Design an enzyme around this catalytic site. Structure first.
Site, PDB file in Angstrom:
ATOM      1  CB  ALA A  60      -0.899  -0.007   1.218  1.00 15.74           C
ATOM      2  CE1 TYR A  64      -2.842   3.211  -6.470  1.00 20.51           C
ATOM      3  CE2 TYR A  64      -3.610   0.937  -6.350  1.00 20.51           C
ATOM      4  CZ  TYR A  64      -3.360   2.081  -7.085  1.00 20.51           C
ATOM      5  OH  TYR A  64      -3.604   2.107  -8.437  1.00 20.51           O
ATOM      6  CG  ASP A 129      -3.243  -6.082  -7.184  1.00 16.66           C
ATOM      7  OD1 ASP A 129      -2.099  -6.552  -7.105  1.00 16.66           O
ATOM      8  OD2 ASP A 129      -3.700  -5.562  -8.214  1.00 16.66           O
ATOM      9  CG  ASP A 131      -6.560  -2.288  -6.606  1.00 23.30           C
ATOM     10  OD1 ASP A 131      -6.883  -1.996  -7.778  1.00 23.30           O
ATOM     11  OD2 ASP A 131      -5.831  -3.274  -6.377  1.00 23.30           O
ATOM     12  CG  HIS A 151      -6.597 -11.605 -16.127  1.00 23.15           C
ATOM     13  ND1 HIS A 151      -5.561 -10.703 -16.008  1.00 23.15           N
ATOM     14  CD2 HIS A 151      -7.683 -10.893 -16.508  1.00 23.15           C
ATOM     15  CE1 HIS A 151      -6.005  -9.492 -16.314  1.00 23.15           C
ATOM     16  NE2 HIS A 151      -7.287  -9.585 -16.621  1.00 23.15           N
ATOM     17  CB  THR A 163      -2.012  -9.502 -22.921  1.00 25.68           C
ATOM     18  OG1 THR A 163      -2.363  -9.737 -21.553  1.00 25.68           O
ATOM     19  CG2 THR A 163      -3.254  -9.039 -23.681  1.00 25.68           C
ATOM     20  CD  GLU A 221      -1.241  -9.865 -15.343  1.00 23.21           C
ATOM     21  OE1 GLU A 221      -1.948  -9.795 -14.317  1.00 23.21           O
ATOM     22  OE2 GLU A 221      -1.566  -9.340 -16.435  1.00 23.21           O
ATOM     23  CG  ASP A 244     -13.620  -4.919 -12.386  1.00 27.80           C
ATOM     24  OD1 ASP A 244     -14.776  -4.521 -12.160  1.00 27.80           O
ATOM     25  OD2 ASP A 244     -12.685  -4.146 -12.685  1.00 27.80           O
TER      26      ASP A 244
END
Ligand SMILES: CCCCCCO[C@@H]1O[C@H](CO)[C@H](O)[C@H](O)[C@H]1O[C@@H]1O[C@@H](C)[C@@H](O)[C@@H](O)[C@@H]1O
Ligand code: UDP
Ligand code: HG
Ligand code: HG
Ligand code: HG
Ligand code: HG
Ligand code: MN
Length: 263
Positions: A60, A64, A129, A131, A151, A163, A221, A244
């Protein structure tokens, strides 16, 4: 080691799979964790009998630190409840870490930034993470020597669309005919030994890249994906574990949304 006690639960049915809509085991025989594939009572017993301690690490930095309160309060309601948990908050603002009330057997350490410790303090490390917020159960079903998480934007994609870093000049390079899954850098973990092996390998690969004047398309990543391609994870977490909702909704394949992005 020790025997499980007598337990009464539904008999598993050999000719009846739990989930028929998704792949629940990888080609290298690692379970892919989805709701309906595990009996949490059996797993809680197995891990509690070993007095398992789980470390949860989060960074953080700068703005953040604002995400810490919700992250920690929801982790208290949903992450490894009943087990020993040690939170490690890496931050540049120690005094900005919120005072969150913790359940018994759970502790938090603030580490200022600007290791052998883990080996003696926890059995497993889970790296995520900040967030984010927990909305449902995230427990011992994820624990294993090494795990990655699918993902949420690519679990239904063909490998050619992943990707991955595509330039052969990068240590993270993965050609179009290789790749099992696209793992998200926001949630990985395993035994302390395996997590340190992974982080050491990615750090060294990123240094080689920097010395060659190249930076992988998706940074850490991209390297995590190259590592998990060559060192297969012993469990893979489904997107239930990294979602998400604003971006992707709530597809039929997800019976639970467990850990989600904060808008
Ligand atoms: C509106 C932005 C759409 C981004 C969707 C794809 O997610 C991103 O995927 C790349 C790899 O191709 C990285 O993994 C990146 O971190 C991802 O973005 C983050 O995660 C998604 C799910 C969403 O929460 C974004 O807001 C994040 O920035
Ligand atoms: O100023 C910053 C940018 C990133 N991070 C940390 O790095 C992670 C990755 O960043 P971010 O969540 O912004 O990436 P995204 O999920 O948007 O790809 C964050 O969750 C934080 O833990 C941070 O602490 N401070
Ligand atoms: Hg970590
Ligand atoms: Hg992390
Ligand atoms: Hg790295
Ligand atoms: Hg990595
Ligand atoms: Mn994030």
């Amino acid at each position: 080691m020790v025997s499980l006690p007598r337990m009464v639960y539904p008999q598993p049915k050999v000719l009846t799979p739990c989930r028929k809509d998704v792949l629940v085991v990888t080609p290298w025989l690692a379970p892919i964790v989805w709701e309906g594939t595990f009996n949490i009572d059996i797993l809680n017993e197995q891990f509690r009998l070993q007095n398992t301690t789980i470390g949860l690490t989060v960074f953080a930095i700068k703005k953040y630190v604002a995400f810490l309160k919700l992250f920690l309060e929801t982790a208290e309601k949903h992450f490894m409840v009943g087990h020993r948990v040690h939170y490690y908050v890496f931050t540049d603002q120690p005094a900005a870490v919120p005072r969150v009330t913790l359940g018994t057997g759970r502790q938090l350490s603030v580490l200022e930034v600007g290791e052998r410790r883990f080996l003696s303090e926890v059995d497993y490390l889970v790296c995520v993470d900040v967030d984010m917020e927990f909305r449902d159960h995230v427990g011992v079903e994820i624990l294993t020597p090494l795990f990655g998480t699918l993902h949420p934007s690519f679990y239904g994609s063909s490998r050619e669309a992943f990707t991955y870093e595509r330039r052969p000049q990068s240590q993270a390079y993965i050609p179009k005919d290789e790749g099992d899954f696209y793992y998200m850098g926001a949630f990985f973990g395993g035994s302390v030994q395996e997590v340190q092996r992974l982080t050491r390998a990615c750090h060294q690969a990123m240094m080689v890249d920097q010395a060659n004047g190249i930076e992988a398309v998706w940074h850490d990543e991209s390297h995590l994906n190259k590592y998990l391609l060559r060192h297969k994870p012993t469990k893979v977490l489904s997107p239930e574990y990294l979602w998400d909702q604003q971006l992707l909704g709530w597809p039929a394949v997800l019976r639970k949304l467990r850990f989600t992005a904060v808008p």
